[PDB]
Amino acid sequence: NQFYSVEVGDSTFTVLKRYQNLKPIGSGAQGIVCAAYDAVLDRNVAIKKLSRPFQNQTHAKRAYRELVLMKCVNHKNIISLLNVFTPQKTLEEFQDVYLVMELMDANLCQVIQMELDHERMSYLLYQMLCGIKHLHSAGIIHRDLKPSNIVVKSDCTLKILDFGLARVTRYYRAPEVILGMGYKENVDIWSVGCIMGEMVRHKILFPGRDYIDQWNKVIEQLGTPCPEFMKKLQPTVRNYVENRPKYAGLTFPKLFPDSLFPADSEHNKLKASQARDLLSKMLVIDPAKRISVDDALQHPYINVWYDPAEEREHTIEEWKELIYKEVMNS
Ligand SMILES: Fc1cc(-c2cc[nH]/c(=N/c3ccc(-n4cnc(N5CCOCC5)n4)cc3)n2)cc(N2CCOCC2)c1
To answer: Which atom of ligand 1 is nearest to the CA of 106?
Structure first.
């Protein structure tokens, strides 16, 4: 009797009666996420349904990670779980997991549409780098950060929704992932560069129409990479890059003109310089040349926010056991 059902999108959410007035908030790769109101806590929450997460390896490792690491990757800038629950009575009938989170006012897509403000942008970027620093400290390298999986409250507080990849749309993925040529921690830095440049441009930086067109749209802008970057590409992929035309790219001033930034001040003039110098350090193809999370936090555009104070594979059935026992703990 504790549960009721409601249509959400193309699906059915079955949730505890404390959650009321379910309104679609958006959708993603675990489908619809609903806003609701929590009567027992008297606030708004966001509810996401994992439909058969144990169904295959990739769904299962993702749900399982999300469920365990939410208990130890505590963060100021990482969203938190208020509640996890299934409407099913036993392991045998177990099907779906519902993840309940604090409700945030918008995603970054919505904030990118706004006019360029230097205090807002450096604040947001600071929080993002910090959230990511903490992801790394806990052994999590995300690899999939995009405006749609970062959310912000109305006072510009920011939280990363999820933990990303395991281990068409590649607009924000790093050159080292596209090419499947191995990665280190500064892979997340590239996604922060794409996001910051989009705040300046109000247009997707690398808006590819295919896996191939994505790579050109990146080389057309930043220029072709060096010989040392190349020699590290797995032999099939090495030929497609090396054998293309050489592209020269554009200077960061011509990638992000003066006309995109506020002005008629020396503050604004300094800030524009700082923004572009950070852009030029994040938006670098070769991961060996790309600024790290720590140096990005010390960057003069960002450091004004500093505050003295601060793998195994399993059976379907074993995954179901694992996930189910995690749901029965809190
Ligand atoms: F206006 C808004 C307020 C809030 C909001 C506020 C609080 N918590 C919250 N919880 C959320 C929201 C969304 C997601 N995911 C969305 N996509 C995925 N994927 C797809 C690919 O990668 C794997 C999982 N998770 C997860 C938790 N969402 C959320 C948005 N959208 C709604 C969802 O989409 C973009 C943000 C808009």
So the answer is: 1
CA–CA gap between residue 39 and residue 18 (Å, rounded) = 5
Q: How distant, in Å, are the alpha carbons of 49, 241, 267 from that of 235?
A: 41, 11, 49
Residue 117 falls in the annotated catalytic set: no
The answer as to whether 327 is a domain residue is no
Provide the 8-state DSSP code for 258: G
Q: What CATH number should be reported for the domain holding residue 112?
A: 1.10.510.10
Antiparallel, parallel or unpaired: β 43-51 and 19-28: unpaired
316 inside domain? no
Does some domain include residue 243? yes
Hey, what amino acid is at 16?
Answer: L
Q: Is the dihedral of CA 285, 288, 290, 293 positive or negative?
A: positive
CA 112 to chain CA centroid, nearest Å: 15
What is the CA(107)–ligand 1 centre distance, in A?
Answer: 7
User: Given strand 158-160, what is the order of strands in its sheet?
Assistant: 106-107, 150-152, 158-160
End-to-end CA distance of the chain: 22
Are residue 90 and residue 194 in the same domain, yes or no? no
Are 126 and 78 in a shared domain?
no
Ligand 1: distance of its center to the CA of 103 in Å?
10
Catalytic entry in 96, 144, 162, 188: 144
CA-nearest residue, atom 15 of ligand 1: 28
Tokens linked to 151:
């959310």
**How far apart (Å, rounded) are the C-alpha atoms in residues 153 and 141?**
24
Q: Are residues 101 and 174 in the same domain?
A: no
The residue range of the domain holding 189 is 106-309
Residue 329 lies in a domain: no
Using the mean position of ligand 1's atoms as its centre, give its distance from the Cα of residue 26 in Å: 6
Q: Which residues line ligand 1 (CB under 6 A)?
A: 25-26, 28-30, 33, 46, 48, 101, 103-104, 106-107, 148-149, 151, 161-162
> Does residue 12 sit in helix, strand or coil?
strand
Q: How many angstroms separate the CA atoms of 62 and 54, rounded?
A: 9
Looking only at the bridges linking them, the beta strands covering 150-152 and 43-51 are unpaired
Residue whose CA is closest, atom 26 of ligand 1?
161
Experimental approach taken: X-ray
